[PDB]
Amino acid sequence: PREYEFAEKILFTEEEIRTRIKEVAKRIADDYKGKGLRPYVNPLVLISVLRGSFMFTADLCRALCDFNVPVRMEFICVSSYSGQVRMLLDTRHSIEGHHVLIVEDIVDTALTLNYLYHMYFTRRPASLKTVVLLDKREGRRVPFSADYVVANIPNAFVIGYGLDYDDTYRELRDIVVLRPEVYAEREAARQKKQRAIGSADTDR
Amino acid sequence: PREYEFAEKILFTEEEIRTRIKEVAKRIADDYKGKGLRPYVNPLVLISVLRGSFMFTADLCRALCDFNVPVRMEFICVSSYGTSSGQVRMLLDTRHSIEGHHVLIVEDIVDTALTLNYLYHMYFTRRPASLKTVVLLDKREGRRVPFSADYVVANIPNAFVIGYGLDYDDTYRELRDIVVLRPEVYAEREAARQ
Numbered sequence: 001p002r003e004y005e006f007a008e009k010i011l012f013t014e015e016e017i018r019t020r021i022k023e024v025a026k027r028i029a030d031d032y033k034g035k036g037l038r039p040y041v042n043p044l045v046l047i048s049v050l051r052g053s054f055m056f057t058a059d060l061c062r063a064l065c066d067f068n069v070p071v072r073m074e075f076i077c078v079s080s081y082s083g084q085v086r087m088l089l090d091t092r093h094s095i096e097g098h099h100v101l102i103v104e105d106i107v108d109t110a111l112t113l114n115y116l117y118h119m120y121f122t123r124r125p126a127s128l129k130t131v132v133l134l135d136k137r138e139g140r141r142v143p144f145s146a147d148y149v150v151a152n153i154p155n156a157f158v159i160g161y162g163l164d165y166d167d168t169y170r171e172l173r174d175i176v177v178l179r180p181e182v183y184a185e186r187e188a189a190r191q192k193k194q195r196a197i198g199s200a201d202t203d204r
Numbered sequence: 205p206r207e208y209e210f211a212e213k214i215l216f217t218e219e220e221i222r223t224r225i226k227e228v229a230k231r232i233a234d235d236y237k238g239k240g241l242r243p244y245v246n247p248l249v250l251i252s253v254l255r256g257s258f259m260f261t262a263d264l265c266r267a268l269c270d271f272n273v274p275v276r277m278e279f280i281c282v283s284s285y286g287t288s289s290g291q292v293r294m295l296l297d298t299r300h301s302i303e304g305h306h307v308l309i310v311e312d313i314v315d316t317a318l319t320l321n322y323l324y325h326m327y328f329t330r331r332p333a334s335l336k337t338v339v340l341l342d343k344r345e346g347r348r349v350p351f352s353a354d355y356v357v358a359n360i361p362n363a364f365v366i367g368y369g370l371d372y373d374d375t376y377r378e379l380r381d382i383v384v385l386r387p388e389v390y391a392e393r394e395a396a397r398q
């Protein structure tokens with residue numbers, strides 16, 4: 001019964017999301033069952049890639065607790081300059097000798113996940129896997145597969161549940177698709193204010 | 205209810221928390237209603253202070269969407285130095301300027317309030333249009349400096365809680381409920397000679 005004037009439709013609802021997550025969670029706890037996870041010494045370190053995945057991470061770990069999987073929360077922040085490769089915040093502690101699970105919001109071209117994967121993989125972790133809230137499969141620019149996928153979606157601009165558009169709509173409880181209407185009406189006013197060529201460097 | 209061997213008693217349950225947040229979300233919406241929050245141009249900037257607030261922040265903004273309050277999520281990360289001033293090291297700053305915007309700092313708990321007062325002052329200097337703070341938990345007696353939040357989800361006694369984002373030795377942040385760590389563990393873990 002939720003509606004968003006700015007959305008063209010609705011891909012998943014809060015509850016639908018909760019279910020798939022609870023599902024993959026269980027599937028994650030089962031794969032690590034024989035790895036000997038332990039609080040304090042051998043936790044499953046979750047590298048939460050800010051900022052798209054903040055919501056998915058909140059719920060994801062809680063679900064993982066329901067299946068008694070000790071985890072350690074790590075938060076890194078990446079950005080774009082393609083692919084979000086500019087590192088703005090790295091992990092708080094070492095990941096060496098630990099089992100790590102990179103938590104990404106949505107893998108599209110995979111340029112980011114691919115980059116983050118090899119990056120941390122070279123930091124000798126006990127093992128490295130990946131989990132993404134959404135997979136766009138048909139958008140890859142490099143070959144990359146996420147160990148765990150919450151849902152596969154068709155190429156479209158999604159927002160909500162942590163996902164965003166110009167830092168907007170992250171707070172939605174549901175995963176909806178931005179109306180191309182707003183995309184245009186919005187960037188046209190953004191790419192405008194941006195071009196405020198204030199470069200008043202009048203040297204001469 | 206859930207059983208927690210390492211926990212001594214539960215202070216609040218997910219559902220108990222889900223409720224108090226709605227009421228606080230509600231209040232916030234009532235307060236900022238006369239300002240004119242509008243997406244993109246003038247939203248309620250939430251400065252989520254990693255990492256104790258990762259989970260609180262997540263629910264809070266969803267509850268705020270319910271009362272249809274436009275928000276902008278900013279994630280900042282601080283670190284200690286090794287200071288009776290509260291000074292901390294900035295590891296991650298807001299991506300956008302908070303000047304001329306209404307800001308709401310989202311902290312997980314406020315014991316000594318040293319870090320929070322420092323963060324408050326700092327951002328205060330950046331000329332925001334207004335600046336308030338919302339805390340999941342509060343220990344009014346353990347203040348090492350004068351400070352009062354603007355929205356306290358729940359007041360608590362000077363105990364040592366964990367869960368719902370809060371930690372102990374970088375552990376237990378994933379708990380769904382806020383619980384009190386039993387001494388036996390706090391001591392058995394303090395075998396810091398290795």
Ligand SMILES: O=c1[nH]cnc2c1ncn2[C@@H]1O[C@H](COP(=O)(O)O)[C@@H](O)[C@H]1O
Nearest residue numbers: 052107108109110111112156157158164
């Ligand atoms: O439809 C979308 N909506 C919002 N963000 C997106 C969307 N597609 C990709 N992203 C973001 O782009 C980042 C990098 O994607 P990739 O490098 O193409 O794998 C992801 O972590 C997301 O934050």
Ligand SMILES: O=c1[nH]cnc2c1ncn2[C@@H]1O[C@H](COP(=O)(O)O)[C@@H](O)[C@H]1O
Nearest residue numbers: 256314315316317318319320364365371
């Ligand atoms: O009872 C507690 N359990 C876990 N962490 C706590 C507790 N009390 C305070 N903290 C942490 O100590 C930090 C500093 O407190 P503040 O300066 O009063 O905000 C908080 O941001 C929390 O991360």
